[PDB]
Amino acid sequence: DIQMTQSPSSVSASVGDRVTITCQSSPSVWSNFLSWYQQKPGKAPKLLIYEASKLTSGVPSRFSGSGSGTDFTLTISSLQPEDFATYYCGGGYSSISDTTFGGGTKVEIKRTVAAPSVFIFPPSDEQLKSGTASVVCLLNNFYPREAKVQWKVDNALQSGNSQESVTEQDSKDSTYSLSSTLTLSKADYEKHKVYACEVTHQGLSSPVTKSFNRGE
Amino acid sequence: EVQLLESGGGLVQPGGSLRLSCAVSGIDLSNYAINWVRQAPGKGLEWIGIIWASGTTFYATWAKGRFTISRDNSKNTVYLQMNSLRAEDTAVYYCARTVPGYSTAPYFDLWGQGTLVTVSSASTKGPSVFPLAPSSKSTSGGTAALGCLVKDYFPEPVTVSWNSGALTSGVHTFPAVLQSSGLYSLSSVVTVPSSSLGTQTYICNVNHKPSNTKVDKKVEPK
């Protein structure tokens, strides 16, 4: 069919760096019908460039597009932390019904290491009434995204009974936040005393531990 | 001051129908061409079709059949009629305007917030809201952290708010995650200064429209 190939699928760059995204379509798009959109998490796409190179109003001069036919490039001159987003290309093909978008390029920011602030939360009494216990461990405002969170119940290393969740990159400081939730049945929760959360991350010399004794 | 607002989104059973509406405020619109673009969760943008100033409509080859666009200028509203929905049609549907002066060209300048449509055979489920209370030693340290755990709901979305909007700084509402139950769950946390505790009240406001579930939980340390 049309085949709209956008690369890279994702990329990390330091603020101030130049980012280059290319979009290659098999059928040469119709007379210059190529556009670029920016989409930040949760928000809708935003038109940055159309006609392959015209910037819409209010778009920073650090954005610019070039190319023609089957090969185009979107270039971000000086990457800012606010540019974190997924970029998409759009193409027309004298069929209208063939309008297609590329797969997108997730552009993330590379900043210096920042250690996480760790907190732990025991399950509430209201939830204990329902027959289930959820223990929550919060890793706040850190970078890089990679982090290892391990649950230890009375030292017994848990495995297969917790889920993690990561926030999108912060557009101001470029950091992340992660939550790890240990979920047990009430009987199993009351079967132990010490619930601990152990975090390993590039910003910490030694892994940090957060815990609480059930009851007291 | 100029925005497009979509509506009609929600839970639909497979094979059911649904009509989304796009209403503009701040401009006429009867003179602009409107497009509907969709995006499955975590996936990319997919064009569905367009309707010109004149009723004329064009559809993506795969949509011409179960999708129909129409407009009512006396109301300044565009409509998307979805028929025989498939689980695959679960997505955020967007309303977007073609740059005035173009047609057929994939240049869309004005978008709507987008409204999520979930095609599923499952019934809606309301969430439980438990507080995540800061530690008793939350005094001193480097500010305290507290939050809300919104557990077991379906489908998305769920919006969480702190102190009816007053508190926005240091707020992190995590992306929802599926549980072995097939239900979503998430938590919204917020870091505040130790001294604020006890003197300042903290309440998270959870709203899950699909189940008409609204809850205000006051998080308190013990």
Between A and B, how many CB-CB pairs are < 8 A? 135
Smallest Cβ–Cβ distance between B113 and the set A44, A50, A165 belongs to A44
Please give the angle made by the CA atoms of A113, A114 and A119, to the nearest 5 degrees. 145
Q: Which residues of B touch A94 (CB under 8 A)?
A: 104
Q: Is A64 in contact with A18 (CB distance < 8 Å)?
A: no
Tell me if the bond preceding B210 is cis, omega within 30° of 0: no
Contact A167 B175 (CB under 8 A): yes
The distance of B218 to chain A (nearest Cα, Å) reads 12
The distance of A31 to chain B (nearest Cα, Å) reads 10
CB-based contact, B5 to chain A, within 8 Å: no
Distance CA B59, CA A97 (A): 6
This structure was determined by X-ray
Look up the CATH architecture of domain A1-110. Sandwich (2.60)
Alpha helices in chain B (DSSP H): none
Q: What is the resolution of this structure in A?
A: 2.7
Please list, in sequence order, all residues whose beta carbon lies within 8 angstroms of the beta carbon of residue A198, skipping any fewer than 6 positions away: A149, A150, A151, A152, A207, A208, A209, A210
What is the Cα Rg of chain B in Å? 21
Helix, strand or coil, per DSSP, at residue A86:
strand
CATH superfamily of B1-121: Immunoglobulins (2.60.40.10)
Of A20, A31, A24, A30, the closest CA to residue A5 belongs to A24
Fold classification of A111-214 (topology level):
Immunoglobulin-like (2.60.40)
* A111-214 matches A1-110 in CATH topology: yes
Fold classification of B122-222 (topology level):
Immunoglobulin-like (2.60.40)
Distance CA A118, CA B70 (A): 53
Distance CA A182, CA B23 (A): 44
Contact A138 B94 (CB under 8 A): no
Distance CA A178, CA A198 (A): 13
Residues of chain B with CATH 2.60.40.10: 1-121, 122-222
Helix, strand or coil, per DSSP, at residue B91:
strand
Give the residue extent of every domain in chain A. Answer: 1-110, 111-214
